[PDB]
Design a protein around this ligand. Structure first.
Ligand SMILES: [Co+2]
Ligand SMILES: [Co+2]
Ligand SMILES: [Co+2]
Ligand SMILES: [Co+2]
Ligand SMILES: [Co+2]
Ligand SMILES: [Co+2]
Ligand SMILES: [Co+2]
Ligand SMILES: [Co+2]
Lengths: 386, 386, 386, 386
């Protein structure tokens, strides 16, 4: 009955179930949650762990003694429940000081502060056991063309991430970074807008091995992109360090619906890929229970995230294991896709008349791909209509 | 009066002005153009050169003697006009054999043929003087999730591009490749859907220095992305080997409107960036005169591409040179964006109380960015309303 | 096992299964189908009927004796199979004469021809038993602002539809019209771009009762709209005269995927609505088997259209009949949504202190909507995970 | 120098320049503005008037004596400046009670309260001289399919608007309503998502003459629609009662950029249409100065709204008055578009061999539309490059 347990490695941000419901046009619909209560409630649902921005766990502007007490209470809740903290991150977007960015703010003093704020929280993350440190530069970007020279901003972004890599190396930490792309919102355009742009940027860092991506379902879908395809490219690059799961209906504001909502077939193909690839990181939900809901609806929405993942996991596994699907995959030449094109080498390909002079293009063209039968088997498996 | 000359380095594909007007829903509205006539007409408008797919210059399936004659006539037209051929490319999308791809077709024999077809045309491109060889993998992708394992497809794509790099190296050619991303159309999703994804892929090739990107205005805009920002990231990476200029109205089918049409302000900021950066490659137009037009309208639309570039060039230069704009840029801290965040180094930043313990976040937050005044100066310059 | 029969009222256009695979970038991948063969193949799959544009059944430019023979053969196929022809339409988009429109072409002679071409085919439609005559004005619109004065074009569009209404009235036909909106493609913007715009236009015709809409799943989704919501508004207006079923992934070119593909949850909610409302018109598929497919894949894709409708029909009925769902609907106040707001009348509402002076806004605000639990029951029913 | 004066009829919402900068992800960046100060500042810029939601002028939950004092101060500011109040509206979206809607909330008590809250503010609007009463049902809609039966919701929406019409009739007010469509945000899908849907709905009200639309540039652009085309359809219907001017870059969250920003060419064609049509209502700006800005930037952004309208007005008038453009319009048959198709009547069209039997489709097809030359004249006029 698709019941999650901590072995399933499902995690949630404090800010997810804790979202009070404020939007562009609306005041809060729910009271604030104490992190202790969210840890307890999430553990009861079968979650494995929780994640946090600095300012979700310790109110911004807290004294040292307040900080210590917030962390102490949180640690007790983790210990009481067995919940883990696999990932943490910095809030470089809410406070007005970050209105033009953190790491790529035009004001240099703000860039330096953003780095100090991040470093302080890396130390805390490591204390709480986090393996991954996410960075979503939601304020990096512009509403107008003159406001932001993007080459200069990328220079600043590289400096910042290189400094953070120097810092973790200096401390001997085993934490790695995961850069989270988003195309827009809250800035008119955000820098590193997709998985591809973030992967490309990482290759230019001083120590690329320390950095990967944290793609989010809805973010790539805000650019109309295929989220499973982007995850495949991240896996191909060896850079899927973390993932954010939720739902989105296309090219809109970021909806943050529960996982499985939004594009259901994309959710199916995502689960199929993560499971086929043996992704071993957390299945993290970055979602918002709609502001229509009370707390009972918050916990129902969170439970639904995990339930939908588990249903889709079952159906994708059944699809791949079905001998009729295995035959359809061969009929569609998925086996041939996985074979090298020219392991014989360049000269042999050049000398191979079957590749040009004697290639019957019409006979090859006439061979159907059989993709529709394959896809209807996939549909039948998803819907439990076999 | 914004008159182009060959010194402006404007180029056009044969398939642009030569588009007969067939669309998803429509038969041709114009007769076919002889490439000789297009070279002559484009030169009269002040173009610098033309580009071609193999199958635009030599009909698919031509004999050797037909090939020779098509090339001879084209060479005569180039010589008669002084037109250049800076770029060429392969058609790996029209023939039905490529219905599932060229380099990433599931059928291995098709992948090998695609490579042979490409190599044949690289030789021709070099003979005609081309410096850049574009690859738009418009058939690489899928309409359904099971049809294409993207990790396997990227393995095949890397093999193909690595073989092409081995080939040009073996021949001692000074041609470089430019990979053209597109998010969708004609496939439901295309592999390497954006500039970022293509840049990331190139970093995993055996000889990355041989490959860059050929971004197209409308392609990035089909994902709702900021084209100037993506061009900035390509320039930051040293990978803007070629560019395709046209117009697009957002998230639709690829419209291929003349340059300056579609998103006019994005066209302004693009020109500003190319000119500020000293981009020295061709300003290539990959556009389609609308099928409403006769040949007179074809040539008017082509002329408009160049005219709009030159108007925007004038206005962007005036913007950057205006001392009132220079003052506004300082007021908005664009100068500070260009300064290193922490050239003092990590330890100095950690020990700098002005960066954390004594940083007045409220005073920094209160300082307006002055971006709206800057942007209205930009608007006034674009519109000739100063 | 979700087997369709003619009682299910599934219909297909000749141009659907008959699509040869030509796209923006690609030549045909399949040979042409004789309409007789498509009628036979569709009947074997359990279809109820077929639909046609004039020029799909009789090649454009046919002589009277060729026309007669094409119709005779088609009629024999219908008689051999028991297939019906519930709908027909005019091709006012393929021939180059329609490059600026049919009914709203700037050239008046083209507008008059479009009307004559339509009237000729209305007569044929009635002979073949069609109840509905669709009009998709795919060429009505513009790529540029000066090319088309939309008020003038709407005047021309109204004249055309009013003339067609006068014609059917004059002949005593019992056929009604169904206007098909689309937002763009092949024109940069199409007139009457959504269900709403078409509904609004109809209200200004001389005999609105003769006209309704023919909404298409993918067309509304090309504007990012909620297709079930638009269908609900059409049903509310009494104007759902016909419907086109297919799949689409968001804001792209019109994909015409098989029904159930694309946005699966939207397909579920659509079926739920059509069945709840007792829609009694044809379930018509306007789709294209992908050009990757051979004929076996064409028929598999067509079969999948019907299969997916029947699966979704079963799941939506089970959802609505489940007493746990019925309780959840009451918990979410769907019953209260269906009750008049103020059947007591305006003055009673004005005098009702419970509506203002004594309304406890905080108590009402605190009551959760319970929509997430309801939606997860819907998900569980769709996936067969109850 | 494009200086606005009150004769230009530019108006602004209190909530525009008064936006404190809170977004999905961000706290306020500016202090609250007293409405008195905004009236004074806007008048100094040359505005004609201001508009308000109830809760922008009188804080929600105010006592009668607080209400009276807020209104008194506002009235004094209007009198001090000569500013008008042409439009008012109700906030049926911020307070948590409206989390599922106002007029279409599932809770009936909320629907009744929404009506009472609206009626109270209609009285105030009339006292302050407003001619138009806007209704933006931003909370009417859903995030999930089961939560909202749209036919039932439209029944509730019609009841509400019919009651409001009964109310204004009963009081003898000369105020009219303007319904503001939006496709999404804050709800996943909003009811009446476009101009077309709102126009269609109005036709089903009890007294349609009392209601029109208040279209917003960015709202229609959030569906990828052509805003000038939608305005043309509203004008064709006689229903453009008010308009909201701003800027938007395509399919995103609602950006609310200053007018002229976003899609500049669409802004040009909009101004051309409003001025050609002789629209005599307010030119109202519903925009948000970006949260990067301080108050000086707020007023610069507001000034830019008006400046851009005036520049575009000049250029559109010059375009239409240019005899070379007038000749190009005739060459493109815009004159013929404006002539009736068949004033000779149906029978004459049926008997006209020039319309079918003797229509030379190839000769008509061959005649180019000359739209690209026309559009480049339009570009040249916009850019001041003639
Ligand atoms: Co998100
Ligand atoms: Co996230
Ligand atoms: Co293109
Ligand atoms: Co291109
Ligand atoms: Co379609
Ligand atoms: Co259709
Ligand atoms: Co807005
Ligand atoms: Co508005």
């Amino acid at each position: 009955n698709y019941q999650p347990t901590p072995e399933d490695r499902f995690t949630f941000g404090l800010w997810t179930v804790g979202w009070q419901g404020r939007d562009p046009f609306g005041d809060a619909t729910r009271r604030a949650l104490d992190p202790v209560e969210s840890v307890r409630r999430l553990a009861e649902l079968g979650a494995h762990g929780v994640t946090f921005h600095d300012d979700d766990l310790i109110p911004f502007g807290s004294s040292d003694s307040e900080r210590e007490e917030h962390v102490k209470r949180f640690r007790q809740a983790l210990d009481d429940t067995g919940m883990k903290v696999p990932m943490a991150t910095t809030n470089l977007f809410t406070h007005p000081v970050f209105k033009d960015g953190g790491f790529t703010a035009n004001d240099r003093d703000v860039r330096r502060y953003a780095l100090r704020k991040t470093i302080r929280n890396i130390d805390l993350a490591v204390e709480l056991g986090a393996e991954t440190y996410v960075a979503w530069g939601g304020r990096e970007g512009a509403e107008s063309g003159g406001a932001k020279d993007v080459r200069d901003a990328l220079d600043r972004m590289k400096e910042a991430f290189d400094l953070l890599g120097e810092y973790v190396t200096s401390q001997g930490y085993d934490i790695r970074f995961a850069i989270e792309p988003k195309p827009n919102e809250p800035r008119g355009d955000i820098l590193l807008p997709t998985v591809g742009h973030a992967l490309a940027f990482i290759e230019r860092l001083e120590r690329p091995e320390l950095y990967g991506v944290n793609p989010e379902v809805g973010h790539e879908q805000m650019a109309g992109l295929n989220f499973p395809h982007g995850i495949a490219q991240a896996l191909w690059a060896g850079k899927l360090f973390h993932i954010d799961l939720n739902g989105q209906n296309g090219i809109k504001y970021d909806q943050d619906l529960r996982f499985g909502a939004g594009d259901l077939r994309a959710a199916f193909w995502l689960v199929d890929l993560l499971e086929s690839a043996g992704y071993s990181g957390p299945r993290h939900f970055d979602f918002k229970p709609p502001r229509t809901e009370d707390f009972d609806g918050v916990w129902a929405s969170a439970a639904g995230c995990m339930r939908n993942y588990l249903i889709l996991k079952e159906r994708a596994a059944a699809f791949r294991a079905d001998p009729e699907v295995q035959e359809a995959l061969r009929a569609s030449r998925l086996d041939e896709l996985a074979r090298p094109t020219a392991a014989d080498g360049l000269q042999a390909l050049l000398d191979d008349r079957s590749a040009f002079e004697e290639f019957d293009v019409d006979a090859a063209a006439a061979r159907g791909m059989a993709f529709e039968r394959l896809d209807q088997l996939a549909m039948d498996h998803l819907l439990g209509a076999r």
